[PDB]
Amino acid sequence: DKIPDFVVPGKCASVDRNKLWAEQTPNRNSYAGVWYQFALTNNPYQLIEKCVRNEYSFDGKQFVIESTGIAYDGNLLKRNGKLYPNPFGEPHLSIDYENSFAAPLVILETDYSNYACLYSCIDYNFGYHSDFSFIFSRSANLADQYVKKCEAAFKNINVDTTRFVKTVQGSSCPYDTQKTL
């Protein structure tokens, strides 16, 4: 039998959230601004296929997100999101979007000015989990030195980095239009 490659035997990995959480709380303003999705592992929830541009505004208690790009049907699309602390006090953020589920979102590693390596995982009741990983860049491109940092981070939590797929970005993307949606 075959199943989606994002449904994986066993439980979600450990991932040292308290340390990350404590590193990241002082730095929220530095995480704000525009992040481009450089690559992601197979994600059946992401409605934006190409030119994925995530604009974050920090209001002192959460991030308000405008996510834009080209949808799977070829039209421009804007999605309104939020990133806020997990409501049970767990050491991670919840990422939430209009007309969507909300999920944990761990920042496995970031330097704030070039890249971010993001991770979400869910355990199922039948001995499997699904996880969803992302490489974010402050630009349309991302140098291999930074990509390799994320590769290391994901390998360290036993994520198969051959699962990453690059997202269309760059001069073919109507970013100046997207930012006005």
Residues in contact with a second copy by the rule CB under 8 A: 43-47, 49, 72, 80, 82, 84, 87-88, 90, 94, 96, 98-104, 122-126
| 59 contacts: CB under 8 Å, gap ≥ 6 | none
As measured in angstroms, the least distance from the Cβ of 125 to a second copy is: 5
Token pair 């530095």 in the structure block, residue: 30
As measured in angstroms, the least distance from the Cβ of 25 to a second copy is: 20
Which CB sits closer to a second copy, 34 or 47? 47
Q: What is the dihedral of CA 20, 36, 149, 96, to 10 degrees?
A: 30
105 beta partners:
93
As measured in angstroms, the least distance from the Cβ of 45 to a second copy is: 7
Which CB sits closer to a second copy, 33 or 91? 91
CA distance linking residue 148 with residue 62, whole number of Å: 29
Which CB sits closer to a second copy, 72 or 155? 72
Contact 56, 79 (CB under 8 A): no
Which CB sits closer to a second copy, 21 or 84? 84
130 beta partners:
7, 122
DSSP 121: E
As measured in angstroms, the least distance from the Cβ of 72 to a second copy is: 6
